[PDB]
Amino acid sequence: GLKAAQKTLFPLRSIDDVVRLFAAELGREEPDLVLLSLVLGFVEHFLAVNRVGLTYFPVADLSIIAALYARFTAQIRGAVDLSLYPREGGVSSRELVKKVSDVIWNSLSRSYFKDRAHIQSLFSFITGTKLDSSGVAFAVVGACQALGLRDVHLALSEDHAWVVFGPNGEQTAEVTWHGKGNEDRRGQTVNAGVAERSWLYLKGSYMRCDRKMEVAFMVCAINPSIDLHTDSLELLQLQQKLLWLLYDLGHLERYPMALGNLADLEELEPTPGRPDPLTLYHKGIASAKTYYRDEHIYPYMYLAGYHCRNRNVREALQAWADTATVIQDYNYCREDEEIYKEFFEVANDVIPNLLKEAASLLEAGSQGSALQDPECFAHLLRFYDGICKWEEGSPTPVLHVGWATFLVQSLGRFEGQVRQKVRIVSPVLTFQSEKMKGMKELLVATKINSSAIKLQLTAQSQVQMK
Ligand SMILES: CC1(C)CN=C(N2CCN(c3ncnc4sc(CC(F)F)cc34)CC2)S1
């Protein structure tokens, strides 16, 4: 190592002192990822993992943080001999990146629950020898920075992390595992995944972080959970203040998920004088459209979730339709299961429950109901259209009869006089999927033909013999 200037703010005695540290680091040529991660993990440990003795804020003394830092840098410098990996052109080699990844990996406890909370930071790595998947990638990036490898950066998709490095930052390397029971590809590029148009690699529209975005990632990674029922107010406040710092400095401009997480935080506890959650969700979407070819799914899911929680049925349906309009241009591949789960839950749990409540409120005389609005019926149909188009050309199917039952139920929540108002052109809607085009017929009958809908959604050839 730490430079004299990095040590002057210690000891950190409050949330605001932590913020000052982040501000100072973000004003340097290269914010110190190892320092920042250790500090966050320290404070998260004593605010969420073990609050015994807590009276206000766990004071971070320089002696403690410097000793942690020293343990990290000694482990990396000792295990990674740079002389073995000459740096042609001031850039790193694939062998070097693999070596660092191996060092982190080989350091981890043989057996532990990999999706436990509070195993994301370098504090967990040093004190517990435990990291979660994306924590391994971050730690490889922190280790490379500590070694002076200015070219190695964190790459992020909506469900995975890896690194970029090399000439022009153009190389990619896997450095961690993905999911559960997948075969790891550490050391390889991500080009096969990009080529197959999976959600996992976002068709190449994944995030290539700079150092400041790496800081935003560790701040997003703060986990305020104490247990299932309780969050640390202190950590929520810290994460929120740090996200605003990053926002003000321009460092969330290319980070849609961070803007969504900040909006979620503001919904819980708004900061006076700041943009509304809805504004922030829309900025997240704008970020995805501007920097990532509008190929991200979660910016629309964050917005829909807000509208959902506020029982704005119309706007939630619109946002979910827009989510499906993104997914339609992907191929559903092995390893995309997390997004399938999200779409399944929306279709088969969240929407049904929203519409059930809407039906009850309609019975009690509501006005302007989504169930009387043909634009809302159109959004529902557009959501299913994108899911069907997603399925087209995919190596694994998406729909099955489990989805058909909920589709029939959801359609039926709208009276025929409402459904009849949507014009399906080859409120107006154009279908992209062949499944929904063949369904058009069935979508306006007063009584929905349940069996025909099921046949059309699942492309089941036949009915019961006997
Ligand atoms: C609309 C949702 C279902 C609500 N929370 C969502 N999240 C999406 C994942 N979150 C994230 N937030 C900031 N950065 C990242 S990077 C990353 C991938 C990982 F492998 F590095 C995930 C993620 C935050 C939680 S999506």
Give a quick precis of the structure.
By secondary structure, the protein is mainly alpha-helical. It has helices at 4-7, 15-26, 33-49, 62-79, 94-106, 122-128, 133-146, 191-195, 211-220, 233-248, 256-268, 277-291, 298-309, 313-327, 337-363, 374-391, 401-412, 416-419, 434-439, 450-458, and strands at 153-156, 161-165, 171-173, 207-208, 225-227, 230-231, 423-424, 428-429.
Descriptors for this entry?
466 residues; mainly alpha; 4-stranded antiparallel beta sheet; two-stranded antiparallel sheet; 20 helices; 53% helix; binds the ligand CC1(C)CN=C(N2CCN(c3ncnc4sc(CC(F)F)cc34)CC2)S1; transcription cis-regulatory region binding; phosphoprotein binding; disease variant; DNA-binding
Say how many strands there are.
8
Q: What structural category arises from helix and sheet content?
A: mainly alpha
How much is the radius of gyration in Å? 25 Å
| Largest β-sheet summary | 4 strands, antiparallel
Protein name: Menin
Keywords: Chromatin regulator, Disease variant, DNA-binding, Nucleus, Phosphoprotein, Repressor, Transcription, Transcription regulation
InterPro entries: Menin
Subcellular location: Nucleus
Verbal overview:
- This protein is mainly alpha-helical.
- The protein has one domain (1-466).
- The chain has 20 helices and eight strands.
- It has a four-stranded antiparallel β-sheet with strand order 3-2-1-4, covered by helices on one side. The chain has a two-stranded antiparallel ribbon with strand order 5-6. The protein has a two-stranded parallel ribbon with strand order 7-8.
- Strand 2 (161-165) and strand 3 (171-173) form a beta hairpin.
- Helix 10 packs across helix 11 and helix 12 runs antiparallel to helix 13 (298-309).
- The site of the ligand CC1(C)CN=C(N2CCN(c3ncnc4sc(CC(F)F)cc34)CC2)S1 has 14 residues, from helix 9, helix 11 and helix 13.
